[PDB]
Amino acid sequence: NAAEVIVYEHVNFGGKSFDATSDQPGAGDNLNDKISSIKVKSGTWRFYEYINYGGRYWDLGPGEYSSVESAGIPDNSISSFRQI
């Protein structure tokens, strides 16, 4: 199905933003280890600490996560993400 997640460089949806509708083995490339807030628009997404879907991961469905820390995810750590 259609899935969409928006990731942001700074807390409270500030800074550079990327609007993804497909899997991101490099979290784009720009926001690797810079993701600080997230809006999941549709679908369940898995977020990984290392590129190419490696290491610890955390799953999120639709929601506005104004800080990843609040969602139990380490700040500036997400390095890839994909739909699950």
Contact call for residue 36 and Mg ion (CB under 5 A):
yes
Neighbours of 33 (CB within 10 A): 14
How far is residue 62's CA from residue 73's CA, in Å, rounded to a whole number? 16
44-63 positions binding Mg ion, by CB under 5 A:
49
Q: Which of 4, 15, 17, 32 binds Ni ion (CB under 5 A)?
A: 15
- Which residues contribute to the annotated binding site? 9, 33-34, 36, 49, 76-77, 79
Least distance (Å) between residue 9 CB and Ni ion: 6
Contact call for residue 69 and Mg ion (CB under 5 A):
no
Q: What do you get for the CA distance between the two ends of the chain, in Å?
A: 11
Contact call for residue 83 and Mg ion (CB under 5 A):
no
